[model samples]
Target: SVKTWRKIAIDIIRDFDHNIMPLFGNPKASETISDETKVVDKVAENIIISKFKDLGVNVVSEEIGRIDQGSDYTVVVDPLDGSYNFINGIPFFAVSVAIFHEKDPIYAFIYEPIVERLYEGIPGKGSYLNGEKIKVRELAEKPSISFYTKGKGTKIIDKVKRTRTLGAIALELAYLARGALDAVVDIRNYLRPTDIAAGVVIAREAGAIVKDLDGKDVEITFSATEKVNIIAANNEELLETILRSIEK
Candidate 1:
């Protein structure tokens, strides 16, 4: 059950951050996304890697890399999604986990540390936030959107009613799934597979349209090296609007 895995992930991450986190003196760093050498990054990643590998999947983590158990599915995950937020004393980070058979997402989980929001989904079933069924706003309202850290505003920037960025991909997607954030356009070109895997499943299952600049379906593989970008929106109309308005 999607419910079962959700509990497992939440428990592990909670224990790690609660009991095991304060042991390290200066658990902060400025390590680049491509080369993460932070203490909290490594410790947090290990907790997720071990627990997820036991779930009978080939686990691929952001920090310690992949574990080829070779059971059936692949779990591409990040124990702490917002490394910058954690290091900089900003309480806006999360744990993101996604399961995929082949290249398609099956189940996803995103748990925010500060907000204590739990977002999860099983494709073809439904999306949920904090143990309650959640859906996107059925009606678009002036097209509120969120962007990544380095994303410069597009031509359509000023045309929208509101714009924001939480600095956490999975949490942003969780918020997007619940209608708090209407969309996300990540132009940083630095998003790894672990950063957005869980978000993809939650967003799509919650009636959102996630795609690339070419208007093609945006899907990510379980690769630690390959990076990608996305232009996900709350509705199909907004998707096309953002897609057409962004630069080619």
Candidate 2:
């Protein structure tokens, strides 16, 4: 079944490249949603939701909300993460999906179209980027961080040398998983399940220590409207360094 999920991820990414990405920000006015929903989102959302439903899985989607099918696990999807970027032609978007059971993620996929890379995370197994294993990288003297708060959140502590807010949570977390960034602090707390689920799992499996500001294990709820503050570090030492450095 895990392998089946892998195939599904591959299929999703393939379809994403061929059918979804090319559309950019166009709109087809899906009868399923309000006129405000972008046509691009509608296409990816419907495709992901329908495919999951075909497997009898409960789906919590970003565009049309939840499609309950009475399944044990739920597929939380952000068909197009960084919609704004995609719409504006920034090419930093991602197709992210996470399979969750009881507030925990079992599998996750974050595929970025620009690089044509897929970051897959499986609990207790490992994380892969482009089908090859990847892990968070060791920090430099100053360490690099990705900040995602509205303002210059948590005061950017002097401990880190580099920082950025990419506006794409999934891709940013995938970057963390691959050591592209030493740590990521999401202070917005408006992140939905579809936003952080895949990235959290991917980063965690890649050896990134994920925790909330409260120092508790990051929780993944089923609701698409939920949000939280998340911090992912490459190791425990860096986590403590980040935790102590950031302010409330």
Candidate 3:
């Protein structure tokens, strides 16, 4: 079962990079980057859905919605994460893929094309960053943390000493695994499953604490689009402070 599923996933990744990356990278392209991004996402979604259909797996994707292919297994994918960064020539964008048996993700992969880093997670097998084992460090007091916010949480910037808004949450989470930052707060309400799904698995696999704003385990319900108020931390103390500060 894993052999079949893994092959399909790999094909999806290769097809996405081959067909989509060029459109985003061309400076002289006539279409706006946003339009190109949507097109690429749609194309990638179609590729995934079709491939999964062949494999008899149900698939739900960000752009194409749900495809019931008569299979119980579902795979969630973010064809392209961080379109702004990709369009703006920033190197920190990714293609996120997560496979679920029932409602829980069993396999996850976040691939950064520019750097060619594949962050992978398999349930009970631990997490890997470019084939090397990795984990989140313990949270520290007065730690330097990076937070992502939309207009809702932008005001909180006035209260913190060191903070950053990196457009790519997957990469930010990868950095969180390496202890590059203490924690990440995402109060943006518009995040989709593709946005945080793979990152969530990789972060958890790397020993980081991931909780919703109300301190709940994230569920795999890709029903309505929702904002995610997440606090990701290397250790407990920093995470607690972040949660408390946001509440205040």
RMSD after CA superposition, every candidate? 3.6, 2.8, 3.4
lDDT of 2 by residue, 1-248 (tens): 35588899888888887888776654332223544665675677567767888888888876667887788878888888887887777768898889987566889998898888889999899999888999989876778888877663454557678788787988899999998999888877687656787888899889888898778877656665556788888877777766675667
Best by lDDT: 2
Residue lDDT tens for model 3, 1-248: 46654565566668767876676655532353362445555565566556666767777775667777766677776667777777667666787777878777888888777777777877788888767888887655446667766555554455455787777887778777766777778876667655677777878788888888777766644444666668777876666656666742
What is the lDDT for 206 in model 2? 92
Question: Compared with the true structure, what per-residue lDDT tens digits does model 1 show for residues 66-129?
Answer: 7887667888778777767677777777778888887777788887756667788789999998
**Model 1 alpha-carbon drift over 4 Å, by segment:** 1-3, 20-36, 54-56, 149-153
Model 3 misplaced regions, further than 4 Å: 1-13, 28-39, 46-49, 140-142, 151-161, 192-194, 220-226
Provide TM-scores for the models.
0.85, 0.89, 0.82
Candidate 1: clashing pairs of residues: none
Backbone atom clashes (below 3 Å) for every candidate: 0, 0, 2
Q: Which structure among the candidates has the greatest TM-score?
A: 2
- Model 1's number of clashes is 0
The 10-residue segment of model 3 with minimum total lDDT is 28-37
Report RMSD for candidate 1: 3.6
